[PDB]
Amino acid sequence: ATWTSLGLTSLGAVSMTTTTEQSFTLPVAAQTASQILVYLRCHSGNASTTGADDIRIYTKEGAATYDHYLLMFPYAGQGAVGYNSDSFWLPKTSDNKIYLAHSMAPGSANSGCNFYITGYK
Ligand SMILES: [Cl-]
Ligand SMILES: [Cl-]
Ligand code: NA
């Protein structure tokens, strides 16, 4: 059940303004692993958008995708900070990439999304 921890190794800058599939190349240490452990967190305050953003996180091997999701629910105008996170395992596939896609772009205003690889085996 054990694995090699990478601490909070950022995977990259997450765009808040697109619903396109965002690609991140894995750090080289993880490129020989069989599985990767990732941590995705988000927060939204007085947002510029409203509605559910199911953020899709996945690796792929050919046509096969290995998908996880995280809810971000911006609500424009609110005077509070909402926040969510999840940490989950994905197969480390031959293209050495991991993907993130917003289903609704939450906007940059008063919001954030941070994406890390925290381990591998
Ligand atoms: Cl965040
Ligand atoms: Cl919340
Ligand atoms: Na929350």
Author numbering: 911 to 1031
Which sentences from the paper describe this structure?
Bdellovibrio bacteriovorus is a bacterium that preys upon a wide range of other Gram-negative bacteria, entering their periplasm and consuming them from within. Proteomic and structural analyses of vesicle contents reveal several fibre-like proteins, which we name the mosaic adhesive trimer (MAT) superfamily, and show localization on the predator surface before prey encounter. Structural studies reveal a variety of domain usages (and therefore binding capabilities) at the fibre C-termini, placing these on intertwined trimeric β-prisms. Using independent but complementary approaches, we identified and characterized a MAT superfamily of trimeric fibre proteins with diverse adhesive tips, able to fulfil the long-sought-after role of multiplicity of molecular recognition and handling of diverse epitopes (across a wide prey range), by the bacterial predator B. bacteriovorus.
The β-sandwich tip domain of Bd2133 adopts a twisted fold, trimerizing about strand G989–W999 (burying 5,640 Å2 per monomer). There are several atoms lying on the three-fold axis. Solving a 1 Å tip-only variant (A910 onwards) allowed us to confidently model these as a water, a sodium and a chloride ion. Unexpectedly, there are no homologues of this domain in the PDB (judged by DALI16), but FoldSeek19 found strong homology to Synechococcaceae and Competibacter proteins.
